[PDB]
């Protein structure tokens, strides 16, 4: 299986437009990564991480994005906050894993790197595995916004300010969420 295309990948999408990759028809070894001791965060919900690749699922999805350390605690079952409510939400019945590592050396930049965006405004919260690219002018006042920014009419996406001399809580982190789908279909992803 081509995990190197997801983890050791060159470019990562920002969290508002996170990147889902489908994985099927290959043999995967999980214990290469968990015992690699290369990630700062590796939490698996549902299945035991300890050598339980003795299963076969229909499909395997890998969702990659970039956030900050303060927000890593939000990529977890039943968590609430900016990222979970407005950017990327996981369901309570999560049969999967979340991995994350500090990418301060690759996503920061002197004077700030403002290439990663996060959604700061939304009328409702995101359903599990929803994805919102709507750059509609969020309405915070009584006036309808009519697509133009102005008094009480803010753009929904806002930049990350990734200076390298940040505290760890403010530094960029790369996150990959693995979901294991077992539907009523021929299972092909075994170990």
């Amino acid at each position: 299986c081509p995990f190197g295309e997801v983890f050791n990948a060159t470019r990562f999408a920002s969290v508002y437009a996170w990147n889902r990759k489908r994985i099927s028809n290959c043999v995967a070894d999980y214990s290469v990564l968990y015992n690699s001791a290369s990630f700062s965060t590796f939490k698996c919900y549902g299945v035991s991480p300890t050598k339980l690749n003795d299963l076969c699922f229909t499909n395997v999805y890998a969702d990659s994005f970039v956030i900050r350390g303060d927000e890593v605690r939000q990529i977890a079952p039943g968590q609430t906050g900016k990222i979970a409510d407005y950017n990327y939400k996981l369901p309570d019945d999560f049969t999967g894993c979340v991995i994350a590592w500090n990418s301060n050396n690759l996503d920061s930049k002197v004077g700030g790197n403002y290439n990663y965006l996060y959604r700061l405004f939304r009328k409702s919260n995101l359903k599990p595995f929803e994805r919102d690219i709507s750059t509609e002018i969020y309405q915070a006042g009584s006036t309808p916004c009519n697509g133009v920014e102005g008094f009480n009419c803010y753009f929904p996406l806002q930049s990350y300010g990734f200076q390298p001399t940040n505290g760890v809580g403010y530094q960029p982190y790369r996150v990959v969420v693995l979901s294991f789908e077992l539907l009523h279909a021929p299972a092909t992803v075994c170990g």
Partner: antibody, heavy 120, light 108 residues
Framework: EVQLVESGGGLVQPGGSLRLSCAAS????????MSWVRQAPGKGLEWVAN????????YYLDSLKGRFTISRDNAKNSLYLQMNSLRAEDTAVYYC?????????????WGQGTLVTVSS | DIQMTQSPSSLSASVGDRVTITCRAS??????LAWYQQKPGKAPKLLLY???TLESGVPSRFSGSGSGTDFTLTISSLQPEDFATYYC?????????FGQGTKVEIKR
């Protein structure tokens, strides 16, 4: 990190003026409004001024009666507040905040305001 | 213009207690309300916005509910660092207006 640094507070006599500055860094200064919020001696937050991204719109508290003028220079990532005809009641710690309706104040330790003390 | 009123203005509680602060507006403002924490002498810090969503970096013990004219801020298990004054603001119109604040004290 959102770093907002206030400067310019001091002792002014009643009727005098003062000009406060707010140096900003850690975010795109052009994408946000900017607000000035003061806090009197042990008396809680009172929003006083608001300036747009391109500074084409400015909003104030009518209590101030046109004594205050908000300004911003984007090239310098800087916000300014000109306080004219100062009254004793203007004695307060003044903070600048990044604005999108919501106020983000300066992260620790950078953001901590400047103290205006108006007295005869 | 829009008036904000906080309750109970001064609240005494203990560590590990569950704490709720109430904030009401003189007119409806949908969910365009935010909650801030200020420790003595320091600058205010944004805890919650849009009535319910936690700003990143805030401990998950802080949560907010409400809409229309009624809002509640809730800390699940009070910790020693949570004793401070709390303010609510609205970003529905100008002038931007704060609540008078409620001081959270230590119960003895």
């Amino acid at each position: 990190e959102v770093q907002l640094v206030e400067s310019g507070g001091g002792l002014v006599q009643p009727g005098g003026s003062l000009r406060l500055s707010c140096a900003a860094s850690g975010f795109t200064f052009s994408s946000y409004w900017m607000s000035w919020v003061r806090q009197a001696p042990g008396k809680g937050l009172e929003w006083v001024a608001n300036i747009k991204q391109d500074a084409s719109e400015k909003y104030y508290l009518d209590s101030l009666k046109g004594r205050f003028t908000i300004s911003r220079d984007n090239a310098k990532n800087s916000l300014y507040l000109q306080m004219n005809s100062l009254r004793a009641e203007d004695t307060a710690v003044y903070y600048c905040a990044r604005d999108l309706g919501i106020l983000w104040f300066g992260d620790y330790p950078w953001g901590q305001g400047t103290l205006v003390t108006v007295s005869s | 213009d829009i008036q904000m009123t906080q309750s109970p203005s001064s609240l005494s509680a203990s560590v590990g207690d569950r704490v709720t602060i109430t904030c009401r507006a003189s007119q409806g403002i949908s969910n365009s309300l935010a909650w801030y924490q200020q420790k003595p002498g320091k600058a205010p810090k944004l805890l919650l916005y849009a009535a319910s969503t936690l700003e990143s970096g805030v401990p998950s013990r802080f949560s907010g509910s409400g809409s229309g004219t009624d809002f509640t801020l809730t800390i699940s298990s009070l910790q020693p660092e949570d004793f401070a004054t709390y303010y609510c603001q609205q970003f529905y119109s100008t002038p931007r207006t704060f609540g008078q604040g409620t001081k959270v004290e230590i119960k003895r």
